[PDB]
Amino acid sequence: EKKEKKKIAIERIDTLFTLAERVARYSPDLAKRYVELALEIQKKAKVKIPRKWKRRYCKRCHTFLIPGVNARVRLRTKRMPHVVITCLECGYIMRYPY
Template sequence: MARKKSTNSTTPRHPHPHLFARLNYLHQSAHLLLASGSANLSRNLVSTARTVAKRAVIRFDPSIKRTWCKRCDAVLVPGVSCEHRIENLSRGGKKAWADVLVVRCWRCGCLKRFPVGRVAHEKERNESGKARERGYDVTGEGKEKEEDTGGDPTR
């Protein structure tokens, strides 16, 4: 009979926690060096972080990727190394949900566009009209819809 593996709660979720610690250090150091005035050294640290992540096949969170320029590896801080503005080029700005945040890097002039103001449409299961007509609950609670018996308990 095989031994059960012990479920230790202190095991790391990632296979290489030292790489995540290194990437975290590089990211924080790049922001600190930009604030202290060493923009070129900051760009070098971002480039190193991208290389380490690429070799280890680690994907960055989109919020982290949005703070780096894809072209020149500069750290994008509004008012310090880039400018942010909101554009709406949809028929003279008539569509309020078509707003786009445009981030322009001051070093290389690269533009990054991110949709903002858009309502995410989530697809729900069993949303068809047939499911509603048959009396099934489509909210995901798993209970069938009770019919109105009009006060008659035998019905």
């Protein structure tokens, strides 16, 4: 039953990202542990990150991103439309086509 273990894996990733969002305001290092555990789970079980989570951590430092607290989010659309996200903890900039 590979199907069960892939199911469990996703539920674990989902749990840990949900907890990182809940704790990040108060203990950013705990949130960072949750994010990194989730990624280690993801590559051990060879599953995908739920779409709602995949832009919510810094790909450089693994901080969980709270827009307005430890992250700057802008919509930039005058030329090539994109979302620009800056991790205020390491300064890494992530851009996604809009």
